Design a protein around this ligand. Sequence first.
Ligand SMILES: CC(C)=CCC/C(C)=C/CC/C(C)=C\CC/C(C)=C/CC/C(C)=C/CC/C(C)=C/CC/C(C)=C/CC/C(C)=C/CC/C(C)=C/CC1=C(C)C(=O)c2ccccc2C1=O
Ligand SMILES: CC(C)=CCC/C(C)=C\CC/C(C)=C\CC/C(C)=C/CC/C(C)=C/CC/C(C)=C\CC/C(C)=C/CC/C(C)=C\CC/C(C)=C/CC1=C(C)C(=O)c2ccccc2C1=O
Ligand code: HEC
Ligand code: HEC
Ligand code: HEM
Lengths: 213, 55, 107, 53, 110
Amino acid sequence: ALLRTGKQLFDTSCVSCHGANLQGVPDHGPSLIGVGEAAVYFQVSTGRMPAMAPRKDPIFDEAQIDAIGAYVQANPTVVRNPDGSIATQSLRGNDLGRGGDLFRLNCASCHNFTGKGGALSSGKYAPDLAPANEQQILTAMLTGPQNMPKFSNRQLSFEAKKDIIAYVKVATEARQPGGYLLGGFGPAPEGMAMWIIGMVAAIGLALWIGARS
Amino acid sequence: PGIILALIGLHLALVWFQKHTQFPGPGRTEHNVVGVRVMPVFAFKSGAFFAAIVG
Amino acid sequence: LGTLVAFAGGLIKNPWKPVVPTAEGKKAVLWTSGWTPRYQGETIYLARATGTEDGPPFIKMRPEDMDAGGMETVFPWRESDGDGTTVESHHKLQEIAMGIRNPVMLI
Amino acid sequence: GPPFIKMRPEDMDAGGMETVFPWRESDGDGTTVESHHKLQEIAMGIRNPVMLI
Amino acid sequence: VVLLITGVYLTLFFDPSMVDVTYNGVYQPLRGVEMSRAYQSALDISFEVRGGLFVRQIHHWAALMFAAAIMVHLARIFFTGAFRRPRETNWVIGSLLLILAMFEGYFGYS
Ligand SMILES: CC(C)=CCC/C(C)=C/CC/C(C)=C\CC/C(C)=C/CC/C(C)=C/CC/C(C)=C/CC/C(C)=C/CC/C(C)=C/CC/C(C)=C/CC1=C(C)C(=O)c2ccccc2C1=O
Ligand SMILES: CC(C)=CCC/C(C)=C\CC/C(C)=C\CC/C(C)=C/CC/C(C)=C/CC/C(C)=C\CC/C(C)=C/CC/C(C)=C\CC/C(C)=C/CC1=C(C)C(=O)c2ccccc2C1=O
Ligand code: HEC
Ligand code: HEC
Ligand code: HEM
């Protein structure tokens, strides 16, 4: 009954964009034939799906999404736990150094050293990596959303992907041992903080100690 | 660092021996310096400012 | 003049002396890349990095190991470098990795 | 391949002196990087060398 | 002065070499990575000397305050006119000091 509930839910809100046979309207939507359940999971769970594009709240909730995914697959899969739930902690890896090297070579050019945002050309940008979970990161690098290259499982193995997932989950949630994180970027916030705090306090001390006329 | 230390030394020596400038005011003239003497007051203020900046 | 020249003469190097052996003689560094052929017909693979030190830090690539929207960074392989198990092979792979004109984008 | 080789009693004469180090088979010859590092750590030890007469 | 003191401290722990090594240190997200000896020395200062992170942060903040104070002082001299006839050589000396400080900080954070 998954294939049945999937089509009805798809025919209501998805055929308008892509098509009756999931082949792609020349103006509205893409083909969607070769994509698996992973693209359906990512795009729907991140709220990027049905649209007129930042992340938002999903409309379908964890059962309709699975039915639509099974339907689109029936015409890249998501990873599940041996109990049928979606994997959350199983996707983490143990080689943080390898994950970090791979991230700095493949991913840091667009997001950041530590998964902050990045600017792209003429509008578009790369988002922050904090509000994404492990399955969302996996499906993101498996399907390659807009302007993001698609990383095949044959060019970037599953174990390397798990190491990268572990590395980003550590780089997004570890406490800074040096004081207040000034935004995660380099010396631009540091120069701002310098001019606004240190020099202001020094000049105020000079005004207090010295005279004026 | 050595070159900067030498240039800072020469700079401060010139400032010490060519006396400081001042703003025009009541008792001020192109020929005098109105202010405070080093010994009790100026050294005290300089040391306090140094401590505050280190803080 | 003599002491100035003898004091500053140890730093000066000629950028155009031929030191890099290629398939057509010896060339100057700034004209060679690492993709330059060495013995007139040598196979230089487009190898990708694995980020690990198990045995290979560089593996070959087949045309079907990518999708129609992917980009991969590749380096020159030159099989006589081998995987990095021996110290010699490890040094060869490290000099492959640390070269400013080595990386290539394959789309 | 070997920077250290084992010794047998007959590998010496009655007027010989030899410097010896601790071997520990698990170090192996210095072909791989890990074994090379183990052997370097053997050779750079200030209480390792022993005189056998 | 603060820069001098903190730099003298920092010189007792730094190794400015470019020879490559593997980390194998306490900062687990970098264990097994090929780095230079200078980067490993800086990581050691940060994570295994009691107070080293504090000292190098003081050093970098003092460098930024140095540059900003030099610029504000140049602004005062220029706008009040303290550079005129008797003190032109001192203006020139200060300008040289500014250039030298710029390049010294640039070499520092590299
Ligand atoms: C006054 C002086 C510049 C005149 C020079 C005369 C001229 C003939 C010389 C020739 C030089 C050439 C021809 C052009 C110079 C232009 C430039 C290329 C010079 C290079 C270096 C130059 C000498 C530096 C001078 C800059 C200037 C003197 C700094 C003084 C700034 C003022 C007076 C400080 C007052 C206190 C301050 C406003 C408190 C509030 C904080 C504000 C927001 C500071 C603004 C601010 C600053 C100043 C940052 O540097 C900065 C850097 C990174 C991120 C953010 C900021 C930032 O917000
Ligand atoms: C004698 C002894 C040291 C020999 C060693 C014996 C030997 C056997 C032992 C071996 C041990 C060796 C290896 C080490 C020895 C020592 C070692 C441990 C030290 C390492 C470095 C260490 C950590 C430094 C600590 C010292 C520190 C705590 C004290 C710093 C205080 C000093 C340096 C302040 C100087 C201030 C400044 C540079 C002087 C300028 C003169 C003053 C400020 C006038 C400035 C000034 C002028 C000039 C104006 O014209 C003016 C005009 C208008 C308005 C204002 C001003 C104005 O302020
Ligand atoms: C006409 C509005 C529109 C609506 C409604 C819509 N889509 Fe899309 N969709 C697009 C467009 C345009 C793209 C192209 C990529 C982009 O814009 O991000 C896309 C991309 C996709 C992709 C990924 C394409 C790829 O190449 O990987 C999938 C999967 C998808 N849509 C499925 C869905 C699902 C599930 C729904 C839920 C009913 C839906 N679409 C509703 C317009 C729409
Ligand atoms: C600049 C090219 C680019 C590269 C290279 C790239 N990204 Fe992205 N990434 C993007 C863009 C643009 C988006 C936004 C997609 C969208 O809006 O639909 C995105 C989205 C994502 C998201 C989802 C963000 C969210 O809010 O859910 C994740 C997770 C992600 N990327 C991870 C990665 C990883 C891991 C890598 C390295 C394998 C990588 N990215 C490489 C540009 C890139
Ligand atoms: C005088 C002006 C100086 C400036 C502007 C300056 C600036 C800097 C800066 C910005 C750094 C990078 C700090 C970091 O790691 O984040 C640095 C590093 C360093 N500085 Fe300085 N410095 C100065 C003087 C000195 C002096 C006098 C010494 C030694 C006597 C010194 C010793 C060092 C050392 C050893 C490092 C590397 C250690 C490290 O990076 O952790 N500096 N410098």
